[PDB]
Design a protein around this ligand. Structure first.
Ligand SMILES: NC(=O)[C@H]1CCN(C(=O)Cc2cc(C(F)(F)F)ccc2Cl)C1
Ligand SMILES: [Zn+2]
Length: 140
């Protein structure tokens, strides 16, 4: 579990969005596993606006933050799970690291701010849904 809080927005994994998120929807994209809902109070996370390929992510299944190298956002085949059939997920970045289903939502951060959130895993890999291209998160 986990979310990004920027301005009057809450960014979560689409597959983990609550009834309250759908009842206050801003934008969602099934192919990216992202959903953004509106909030009453202002958030303080800063979104990174960069091309960094190294950062640190939080892994709830280990209660630990790990430094990682990760690939550039791409269209990657993701195996079927209980939330989606087998499909290409877009804007996804992979790293070598531990990830379990409940780790989705963990933040990946570089020196510039929040890069994305854990969205995929298995086989000793962890995938992150990129949020750096969502420039509108910084306004309105
Ligand atoms: N974005 C997606 O398609 C997500 C939705 C939920 N997803 C998962 O459960 C994938 C997953 C599998 C495993 C494994 F290998 F142990 F089975 C470990 C971690 C994760 Cl995140 C994909
Ligand atoms: Zn950066």
């Amino acid at each position: 579990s986990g979310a990004i809080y920027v301005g009057n927005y809450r960014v979560v994994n689409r597959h983990l969005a609550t009834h309250n998120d759908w009842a206050n929807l801003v934008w969602e994209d099934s192919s990216r596993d992202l959903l953004v809902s509106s909030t009453t109070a202002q958030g303080c996370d800063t979104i990174a606006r960069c091309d960094c390929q190294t950062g640190v992510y939080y892994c709830s299944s280990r209660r630990k933050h790990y430094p990682v190298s990760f690939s550039k956002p791409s269209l990657i085949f993701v195996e079927a799970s209980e939330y989606y059939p087998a499909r290409y997920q877009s804007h996804l970045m992979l790293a070598v690291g531990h990830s379990e289903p409940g780790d989705c939502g963990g933040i990946l951060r570089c020196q510039h701010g929040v890069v994305g959130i854990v969205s995929t895993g298995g086989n000793g890999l962890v995938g992150f849904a990129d949020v750096r291209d969502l420039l509108w998160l910084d306004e309105e």
